[PDB]
Amino acid sequence: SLPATHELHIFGSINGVDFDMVGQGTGNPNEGYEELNLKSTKGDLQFSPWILVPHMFHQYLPYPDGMSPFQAAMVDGSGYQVHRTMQFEDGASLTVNYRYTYEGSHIKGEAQVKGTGFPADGPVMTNSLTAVDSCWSKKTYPNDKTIISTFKWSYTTGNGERYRSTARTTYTFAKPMAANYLKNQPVYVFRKDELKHSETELNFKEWQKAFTDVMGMDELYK
């Protein structure tokens, strides 16, 4: 079905220390909006919960004229896997690998996280990140089974100082995407992310809008 509810098991390590979180959410597949609640199964998170944004379900994303490729792959059941890499301005690096299963309108997601090189006194390990910038991503389709998403990410610390990262996401589809998708690229997506957090529990909200009118959107996204 189009998705209506989801759950996330997100787990792995930050600076060689294991964490594990589980929770349920809901979303709007005609608007790309999603809510998620997460709870730790291994006690207090030893890092900023902000570092799990944006990683905490593009199956909810519509396109202007119909379903996104992500949403289309869920509805026919064939699906996709995800690899994301992020390199931070202080030399830290994070990967996330995602796998999904579908039951009618419900998605179960698994996100394996590995983060390394976060300095002890840095704002990740001291939980001093306070917000994230809304931002543009660019989707390209280098072949009928792959989508590449690129974006520049920033957390806020202190007096609006930015803690910057570069992100690249590789989507691998089981079945080729409809041919029309390949002839209508690139796609630009604008997203806004909101987090309420404690050391054990998070409430997350995401809004997203896809744009297929290409223009000089490339000068605007960069």
Author numbering: 12 to 67, 71 to 236
Give the article text.
mNeonGreen, an engineered green fluorescent protein (GFP) derived from lancelet, is one of the most brightly fluorescent homologs of Aequorea victoria jellyfish GFP (avGFP) yet reported. However, we were ultimately successful in creating a variant, designated as NeonCyan1, with a tryptophan-derived cyan fluorescent protein (CFP)-type chromophore, and two additional mutants with distinct spectral hues. NeonCyan1 has the ‘double humped’ excitation and emission spectra that are characteristic of FPs with Trp-derived chromophores in the neutral state, such as mTurquoise2 and mCerulean3. To obtain insight into the molecular basis of the empirically determined biophysical and photophysical properties of NeonCyan1 and its variants, we determined the crystal structure of NeonCyan0.95 at close to physiological pH (pH 7.5), NeonCyan0.95 at acidic pH (pH 5.6), and NeonCyan1-T207D at close to physiological pH (pH 6.5).
